[PDB]
Amino acid sequence: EDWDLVQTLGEGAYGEVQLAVNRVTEEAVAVKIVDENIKKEICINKMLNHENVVKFYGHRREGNIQYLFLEYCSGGELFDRIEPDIGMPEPDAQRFFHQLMAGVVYLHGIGITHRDIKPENLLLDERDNLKISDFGLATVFRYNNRERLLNKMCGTLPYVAPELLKRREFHAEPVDVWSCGIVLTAMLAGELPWDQPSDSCQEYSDWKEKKTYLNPWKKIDSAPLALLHKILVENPSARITIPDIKKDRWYNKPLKK
Numbered sequence: 392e393d394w395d396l397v398q399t400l401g402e403g404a405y406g407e408v409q410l411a412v413n414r415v416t417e418e419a420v421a422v423k424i425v426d427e428n429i430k431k432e433i434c435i436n437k438m439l440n441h442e443n444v445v446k447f448y449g450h451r452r453e454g455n456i457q458y459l460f461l462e463y464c465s466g467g468e469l470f471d472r473i474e475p476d477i478g479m480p481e482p483d484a485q486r487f488f489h490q491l492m493a494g495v496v497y498l499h500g501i502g503i504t505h506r507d508i509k510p511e512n513l514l515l516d517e518r519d520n521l522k523i524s525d526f527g528l529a530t531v532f533r534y535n536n537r538e539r540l541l542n543k544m545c546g547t548l549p550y551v552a553p554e555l556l557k558r559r560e561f562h563a564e565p566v567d568v569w570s571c572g573i574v575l576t577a578m579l580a581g582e583l584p585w586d587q588p589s590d591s592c593q594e595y596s597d598w599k600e601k602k603t604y605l606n607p608w609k610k611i612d613s614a615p616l617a618l619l620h621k622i623l624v625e626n627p628s629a630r631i632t633i634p635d636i637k638k639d640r641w642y643n644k645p646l647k648k
């Protein structure tokens with residue numbers, strides 16, 4: 392390889408992510424090293440071409456270790472921009488949300504669902520532009536203009552939609568929309584609303600009962616909270632769609648710090 396692995400960026404179950412620099416052109420990229428299927432991940436990654444999605448540059452196989460070359464995001468994880476119990480300035484949150492929607496609209500437009508949207512997977516470039524990363528759980532939900540219902544159990548509990556826990560088969564799109572809503576909640580309140588959207592989760596029941604005087608809802612302004620009321624809807628068929636999110640008042644509110 393003509394790429395030098397200069398530093399450990401991410402160390403976790405995903406294997407490992409390193410910063411790689413080309414000792415010739417001096418370009419920098421991220422490298423995910425392994426060494427839940429590389430084949431599918433690469434195949435999905437090859438379809439991606441959007442400013443709010445981590446770009447795929449290629450892959451290399453050496454021994455029993457696969458190398459995924461990806462767009463480097465020096466800004467790191469959105470997760471690290473969320474102050475515990477506080478969140479972040481509403482204008483920053485709105486801007487990141489706008490960028491998140493653009494990325495998701497793009498993926499759904501090509502028939503791909505991410506299935507694990509959360510702040511740890513939303514990266515920022517040098518200009519603080521958001522990029523969706525980690526397509527290890529991503530899958531095709533539309534092919535030849537024919538939608539396929541999902542049934543596989545996956546994602547991250549605090550971020551997963553309730554239908555994924557109750558229904559045998561569910562539509563892909565509303566699930567990603569729900570997780571985006573949980574991300575929005577985290578950005579505005581610096582805390583997750585519930586451990587999981589189950590009948591047995593007190594915090595979730597409180598939300599369904601509109602007990603918005605409780606955390607984290609009490610920390611959120613009326614405008615963004617009204618958007619969250621439309622996104623965090625238990626019945627996926629009644630849940631707001633992205634086209635309608637784009638028409639939301641808070642979504643379209645001019646904001647500045």
Ligand SMILES: O=C(Nc1ccccc1N1CCNCC1)c1csc(-c2ccc3c(c2)CCO3)n1
Nearest residue numbers: 400401405421445461462463464467511524525
């Ligand atoms: O495609 C990427 N990652 C990526 C690809 C596949 C699976 C997982 C990941 N990561 C794991 C760590 N959290 C983010 C997703 C990628 C591209 S740049 C980058 C990155 C950049 C800076 C940084 C981190 C990751 C972690 C903290 O600082 N990660």
